């Protein structure tokens, strides 16, 4: 409690300046547009940003951040930024002069894992709901995440889940509430 904690670095990119924070969650983007929309890194120019999996928040809540925003919000786990950068550099140096095949394998694997990670934000199954309900009549939902074991299930705001997973919600009640 009392400050957020970096749990894992999921990705890295150069995007528009200021396209970080809450407005970068997949649901914020789906509901209000990607603040990094139409960013042709080609004439802009951007800044180094990192996609963060936060401690205690499901992958649906991942946000893009910079070394600066991280520091600004006094997040814990900053040491992980240093390791990530060093590992990243090591990886670059070791792939410096690498056969086309080596580059081939690398790009392939990175896509496999990139896709895998995207599934972590998709509800595979609703498992239960809350007795309490929001003022708007939404109960929270216990979600099973695609690609992750049941130990990663988490309760999620009903309104949020309904905006994209109304099907899972419907099927949940259909198998008899």
């Amino acid at each position: 409690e009392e400050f957020e904690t970096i749990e894992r670095f999921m990705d890295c990119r150069i995007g528009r300046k200021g396209a970080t924070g809450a407005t970068t969650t997949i649901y914020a983007v789906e509901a209000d547009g990607d603040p990094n929309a139409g960013f042709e890194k080609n004439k802009e120019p951007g800044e180094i940003q990192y996609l963060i999996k936060w401690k205690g928040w499901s992958h649906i809540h991942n946000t893009w951040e910079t070394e600066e925003t991280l520091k600004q919000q006094n997040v814990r786990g900053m040491k992980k930024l240093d390791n990530y950068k060093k590992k990243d550099q090591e990886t670059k140096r070791w792939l410096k002069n690498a056969s086309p095949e080596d580059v081939e394998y690398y790009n392939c694997q990175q896509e496999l894992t990139d896709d895998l990670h995207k599934q972590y934000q998709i509800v595979g199954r609703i498992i239960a709901h809350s007795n309490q309900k929001s003022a708007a009549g939404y109960p929270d939902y216990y979600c099973k995440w695609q690609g992750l074991p049941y130990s990663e299930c988490s309760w999620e705001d009903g309104a949020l889940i309904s905006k994209k997973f109304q099907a899972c919600i419907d099927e949940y009640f259909s198998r008899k509430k």
């Binding site: 809450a22 309760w155 009903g158």
Partner: peptide, 5 residues
């Protein structure tokens, strides 16, 4: 439940 408001 909490969201990135």
């Amino acid at each position: 439940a909490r969201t990135k408001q």
